[PDB]
Ligand binder design. Structure first.
Ligand code: HEM
Ligand code: HEM
Ligand code: HEM
Ligand code: HEM
Ligand SMILES: c1ccc2c(-c3ccc4nnn(CN5CCNC5)c4c3)c[nH]c2c1
Ligand SMILES: c1ccc2c(-c3ccc4nnn(CN5CCNC5)c4c3)c[nH]c2c1
Ligand SMILES: c1ccc2c(-c3ccc4nnn(CN5CCNC5)c4c3)c[nH]c2c1
Ligand SMILES: c1ccc2c(-c3ccc4nnn(CN5CCNC5)c4c3)c[nH]c2c1
Ligand SMILES: C[C@](N)(Cc1c[nH]c2ccccc12)C(=O)O
Ligand SMILES: C[C@](N)(Cc1c[nH]c2ccccc12)C(=O)O
Ligand SMILES: C[C@](N)(Cc1c[nH]c2ccccc12)C(=O)O
Ligand SMILES: C[C@](N)(Cc1c[nH]c2ccccc12)C(=O)O
Lengths: 343, 346, 343, 335
């Protein structure tokens, strides 16, 4: 077994054909453009391999055995390490000037990044919604045959978002007849808000007091909005939220009780999911900046639109920031109950 | 023309075969091991493409036309930007534990990075000398190769290296002509005079240990600075491989260093900077590779051979680094007032 | 002379006071928050030092001596290397969770990064125009400052900016003289001819959608390319602040772009490249800052900050937009030996 | 409360005095040299703050409550993220040429990085042994210090190091009890059996047999407590034999819930050692670029001598087939 054979370098290193050269006008920098994209695609393949392995662990029930959480979090962390490298990799293509790009651009048409199957597969499998996608036209229209079918499978199969959702719905602590997290949280917040009101009311009529009253009212609205299941359902329908109400409860349970042993690695998983969303957005941003630098202000706009919350699959995990409360309002988990979160 | 066809993804993305899986025992992390190496090899190919284009520019004489220096420096800078990414890319393989690596390591034998053709081509073309390579198991590096591959390696050894091509170019650096600006002659005179002046200053100081120490430092510095004008010492150091550039090339490099702000030398100075950067980044690649071997295989050995590679013996442009040793006060540098500052304008 | 004295560590390392601790409730992560900002401010000071040194070189006329270009480009490159580190430095503050930030946030009011003097000085000295700044809370940014600081900010607005100093230098670019190489005249003629040639080949093309689309492209390209020679449109766009450089400076920049390989233009081209880099890296800093505000405070300051991530804050947008006016290499007026040696 | 006051910018941003300027010959790049070092020192202070908080969690017994492992690992991870930035930060000083450095180098003498108190504090608190430190020109490291600073350094030498605190914790790792899961006993047995099995196979070529012999020596050496004690005395190992057993327990059973975050902790300790070494390497490379020849002294610092958690790295050496690992079945799975 030889290195070059093991790595199939006879394929990988014989895959570079400059269209400039095919058309009798070889342009040096075209080679960079080819290699950069091939490297992105190798890493996309690796991301898919990790992400699929993690999807399988959820879908086949292995995640139920918490022995497997370490593997889940290491692979999701690995995805974020790769994406970080992919963001840095734009630095290489920034050594190509627009003037030099302009010398081989003609030989590329009509090929486009839009035709990256793997990038679409990755978006789909994480959980980007097609209805939420900004029109440029459809996206699969640029694909046909087996590729179009792969895309459909990726759209119909359970996404990472859906699989994490189901798992969040089973989070220990949500049972009304058990720790009854939601009931206690609602009560504690109501009481806390009542207490705060009394204090502010006790102050003497002033601009300061009014400013406090106003802030209180805002905080109150936000915190209480959390317990409005109907508003959540409405916001789901508009696609401004993605997780079921019960999954949201599970996520918040993990956030508030992150230090409890059974929740430590789950918390890291939630953190990694947010990281992946952020890094995917950063990839899109750098790509936009690159298109602009090469093609000029007039694609740029469409791609700019992709840098938005509509492409953030785990927006709900980010938005749990909005519902931070004083620590002493969090329902206490005394050791008496702590046992259910021990292992 | 479609993306996947343009990039030949039918080759690139059908090149991943896990030996663990071929032998009926698929190990998840083997996939990462394969892709990481394939990405390194794509970027090695790109480095070779840039490096070869720059070698050609020197070898065919195009570098004589100073209009081409921008392209030369952009491409060498590009090589350093890629290498920096290659150093960062070790962070990905650090997400594989040694325990997990141990589950598929058996299926890899006897394949090894030693068999990376492109890595050897890159070392050769930059200018790593065969006689200066550390032997592994008392064997030649090329003995691991055969056929066309062995022949490519020979070509890479026999064709002009970047070191040789830069050498020739440095030897023609304007300002070295005895009949012209006569840089070396003036430099020797100014340093001798400067050393004399410095001796007088120190000797004028009140007898004190500080003075005694300054005396000691002076004596050291004098020996170093004067050693620069000893062409025989240089030849000796060449023979030992502690230097690599010809004496005259060294003069050219120093000319560029001291007169870097003169228009004609601004981009040449950046070139010299980039060559040092490439050497530093190559060394950092080797270091990170060694640390990786250790974390996976443990101490003992390839480890020790690889550690030997992390050294000045593998730094082709070591001479460019070592010109630091011969820094002098700015006022000792032979003056180039516009009267004589004419040949360094574009 | 001792290290700690040379670096005044008696000041630097006695500058960390946790407000949480001052108020009897020390929160561990507040220390990180303090150090991170102090490090940003050290580097802002270094950027100001480089940028001011470069402004002086322009303003006092030293830049006229082309021997000084290496130092100019090294210092601007150094600014970009620092900013790159400042972008990466967000990774440290991402190790603080929103939950932990929430434990000391109250002790910070009413301090804000908005009040960073140095950040404002930096924006001003590069050339962010006050009338182009997005209002915060329906008010001017400088209202957040008082006394000496307010006065420093005004000086920074009234003194010559990097943009203005580069502009004046670009206006003197060799090659623009009608009586000499006559770059603009020749460029207009060559583009007219090239466009005519394209039309002829297009008109000769077989009636087809391929032709129809080539027609559409041609029309668009023609409009863009000819718009370049419309000085009145430029003046209009200047007035709206959608461009920043004088028409003549734009000509100089384009001269440098097209003849970058000519010896006298090699390092000037690197300077233009670096100025774009600084704008891009400033934008990346703002983007990462926004993403971090969102992660900690949730979903406004957020919306104001998002507004800052835009072309209004790109001082050298005109250097980016010269991509838009890329022409085939053969259209570029020839610089043969006869009229070569001047560069 | 105003930003500049909250951050004490009246101190931080009035701490830049160029000696070149003090001596009537201002050199532009000296400013970069000062700021770079000040930034390093701010971050060293932050690393000390994290590291001390973690040492305290061990020393006050809070680590015993496994609820605190997330905080321990987050802060150690934070240390690694800072060190990574500190490695990248050399890129800034690489924008200073040696020629430009040479214009102000004279005004610096005799100041040196050797006099960085915080760097020494950091080395000490992690667990770099003084007896293992390479001497520079036959001089003690503390010789460069005096007064309260010298006293801080002594405290940092005499107080419990991160290494010692982790050691004690590793010694209490569940599973080592002979009367319980009896990890060590079972591991020794399984390895012996496996080696015997391998013998038989090869007997059933000799080139490979040679390697088998080597593996046996390595694997069996693990169970030689006396060799370990000897190597401890020479400072080629640092952890007690029992701590080593705990670490190996965590390595082999990393997926067991109670060991998942502990495994991450061990990983991060190795990361900190690696990153510290990388910092030293980049610093060496920098000295060489500017002075061109303590280049060789600094090179000596880039060694296993300065790797506090070398034992954690070396557990790679003792990897065995998965099926030799004593099984953690329901019988014992409970713990
Ligand atoms: C010279 C550099 C680049 C230019 C000028 C460029 C140009 C474009 C343009 C204009 C689009 C919008 C679709 C279209 O009109 O064709 C696009 C989309 C895309 N590009 Fe690039 N691109 C560049 C580099 C890259 C790189 C390095 C990647 C990495 C694989 C890439 C992957 C993509 C992908 C996946 C899309 C679709 C993204 C989406 O729809 O959200 N491109 N590119
Ligand atoms: C698990 C990670 C790795 C291990 C354990 C490893 C192991 C080794 C070993 C032991 C050697 C010495 C030759 C031998 O005895 O076989 C070697 C050399 C080499 N490896 Fe790796 N390697 C790793 C990753 C990589 C990667 C990612 C590359 C990238 C292409 C690579 C490229 C090379 C090269 C080019 C050499 C020869 C270098 C020289 O002779 O100076 N290795 N590797
Ligand atoms: C926990 C981390 C951070 C949060 C939550 C945060 C929050 C904010 C907010 C809300 C604003 C808008 C003004 C306001 O309403 O107060 C702002 C502006 C700003 N922050 Fe931060 N910030 C953080 C970290 C940083 C850091 C590390 C820097 C570094 C110096 C910084 C510098 C600034 C600057 C300069 C502005 C003004 C930006 C502009 O007008 O474009 N912030 N920040
Ligand atoms: C121009 C760049 C630099 C040069 C030339 C330089 C030079 C030196 C030299 C020669 C030594 C050996 C002791 C001596 O003889 O003085 C040393 C040690 C040291 N330097 Fe630097 N240094 C540089 C940058 C830095 C930076 C950025 C740091 C960061 C704070 C730093 C911190 C240290 C430390 C802590 C030591 C002690 C190392 C040890 O004993 O392990 N130096 N430096
Ligand atoms: C592979 C091949 C091409 C690309 C591009 C890319 C960038 C700029 C372009 N300008 N024209 N074209 C050709 N067609 C795009 C859609 N219609 C015309 C470009 C293609 C980016 N990534 C690529 C990967
Ligand atoms: C391709 C294939 C293998 C490698 C290795 C590598 C790493 C660790 C190894 N342990 N044993 N082997 C097998 N051979 C090494 C020398 N003779 C037996 C390993 C190979 C590194 N890069 C690779 C690329
Ligand atoms: C120093 C001190 C504070 C900050 C902030 C910051 C972050 C979150 C905040 N929430 N409230 N405040 C108070 N201000 C908000 C508007 N005016 C009062 C915060 C301040 C960011 N960087 C800082 C540096
Ligand atoms: C603060 C101040 C100085 C430094 C140095 C440094 C770098 C190069 C030097 N050359 N001489 N000196 C002064 N003495 C050091 C020992 N013998 C002479 C230098 C000091 C590195 N980091 C610093 C931080
Ligand atoms: C048995 C279980 N692993 C319980 C579970 C579900 N979601 C969680 C989140 C955090 C911690 C535990 C869980 C399962 O049902 O998967
Ligand atoms: C005409 C010339 N380009 C001269 C030359 C040689 N080396 C240099 C270094 C710096 C500046 C100029 C040169 C040539 O002979 O290549
Ligand atoms: C003599 C000159 N340095 C000419 C000049 C102006 N702008 C330029 C741009 C690129 C190259 C040269 C110039 C000066 O007037 O400053
Ligand atoms: C009760 C205990 N937390 C047990 C313990 C010690 N070391 C460990 C390593 C991994 C897992 C658990 C432990 C303690 O004594 O700290």
């Amino acid at each position: 077994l030889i290195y070059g054979n093991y790595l199939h370098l006879e394929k990988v290193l014989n895959a570079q054909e400059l269209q400039s050269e095919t058309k009798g006008n070889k342009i040096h920098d075209e080679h960079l453009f080819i290699i950069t994209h091939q490297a992105y695609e190798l890493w996309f393949k690796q991301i898919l391999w990790e992400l699929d392995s993690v999807r399988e662990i959820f879908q086949n029930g292995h995640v139920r055995d918490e022995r497997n959480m370490l593997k889940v979090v290491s692979r999701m962390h690995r995805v974020s390490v790769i994406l970080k490298l992919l963001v840095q990799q734009f630095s290489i293509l920034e050594t190509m000037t627009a003037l030099d790009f302009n010398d081989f651009r003609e030989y590329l048409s009509p090929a486009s990044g839009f035709q990256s199957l793997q990038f679409r597969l990755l978006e789909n499998k994480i959980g980007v919604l097609q209805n939420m996608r900004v029109p440029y036209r459809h996206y699969r229209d640029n694909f046909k045959g087996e590729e179009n079918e792969l895309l459909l499978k990726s759209e119909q199969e359970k996404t990472l978002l859906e699989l994490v959702e189901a798992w969040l719905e089973r989070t220990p602590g949500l049972e009304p007849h058990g720790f009854n997290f939601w009931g206690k949280l609602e009560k504690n917040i109501t009481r806390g808000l009542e207490e705060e009101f009394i204090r502010i009311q006790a102050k003497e009529e002033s601009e300061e007091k009014e400013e406090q009253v106003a802030e209180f009212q805002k905080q109150k609205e936000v915190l209480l909005s959390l317990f409005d299941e109907k508003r959540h359902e409405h916001l789901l329908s508009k696609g401004e939220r993605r997780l079921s109400y019960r999954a949201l409860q599970g996520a918040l349970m993990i956030y508030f009780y992150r230090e409890e042993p059974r929740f430590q690695v789950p918390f890291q998983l939630l953190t990694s999911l947010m990281d992946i969303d952020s890094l995917m957005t950063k990839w899109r941003y750098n790509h936009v900046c690159m298109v602009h630098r090469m093609l000029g202000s007039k694609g740029y706009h469409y791609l700019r639109s992709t840098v938005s919350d509509r492409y953030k699959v785990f927006v709900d995990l980010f938005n749990l920031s909005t519902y931070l409360i004083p620590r002493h309002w969090i329902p206490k988990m005394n050791p008496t109950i702590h046992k259910f979160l021990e292992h």
